[PDB]
Design a protein around this ligand. Structure first.
Ligand SMILES: [Ca+2]
Length: 223
């Protein structure tokens, strides 16, 4: 996250870190056994780390649980990044508490202007490269479909939304992929793609979670 602030410890209890030797993407706990993330984050061994704040230090609220199943959306397209969404089943259930909680799926899609919270441990800098140990946060608005599509002509599908700022300087970046965009208590976005990070007139684009409730529910029921 560029242009963000350090979240209060454990104040984002649905946020997960996916790890295979080190942190590489985020994710969101949506029930005690299942995490949602980005298909482009796929690797075939993942460990899920719940209840994290400082990824570099064992702090003692953490639960580390390996993925038992990894299910990428059957229409994920690695060229357009359409359907950039993936479900992970944990090999045993998360224990839910103060520091570890589920986030709601959307009851509908969100209006333009709605303020949301975006979180993750990705790159913090426009020029260069510094990855934080402490979880970062960013408040930003859902942009209209028109400001999203003027930013990326021909490349915004119906399963994508733009969240952020046209003046640059505030956005998600590499390492935040897979991570939550939460608006009015509902997960409406997954960190997906952009052109660079925090560039003027290239806000981040996000998988539009509201189109995916039926697929998510069905996949959980069948696995
Ligand atoms: Ca820790």
């Amino acid at each position: 996250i560029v242009g963000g602030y350090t979240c209060a410890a454990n104040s984002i209890p649905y946020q997960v870190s996916l790890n295979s030797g080190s942190h590489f993407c985020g994710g969101s706990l949506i029930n005690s056994q299942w995490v949602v993330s980005a298909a482009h984050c796929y690797k075939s061994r993942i460990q899920v780390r719940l209840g994290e704040h400082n990824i570099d230090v064992l702090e003692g609220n953490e639960q580390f649980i390996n993925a038992a199943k990894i299910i990428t959306h059957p229409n994920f397209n690695g060229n357009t990044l359409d359907n950039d969404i993936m479900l992970i089943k944990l090999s045993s259930p998360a224990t839910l508490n103060s520091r570890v909680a589920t986030v709601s799926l959307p009851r509908s899609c969100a209006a333009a202007g709605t303020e949301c919270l975006i979180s993750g441990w990705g790159n913090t800098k426009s020029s260069g490269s510094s990855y934080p140990s402490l979880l970062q946060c960013l408040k930003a608005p859902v942009l209209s479909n028109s400001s999203c599509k003027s930013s990326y002509p021909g490349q915004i599908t119906g399963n994508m939304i733009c969240v952020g700022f046209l003046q640059g300087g505030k956005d998600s970046c590499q390492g935040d992929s897979g991570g939550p965009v939460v608006c009015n208590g509902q997960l409406q976005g997954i960190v997906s793609w952009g052109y660079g990070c925090a560039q003027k007139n290239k806000p981040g684009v996000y998988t539009k979670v509201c189109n995916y409730v039926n697929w998510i529910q069905q996949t959980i029921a069948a696995n």
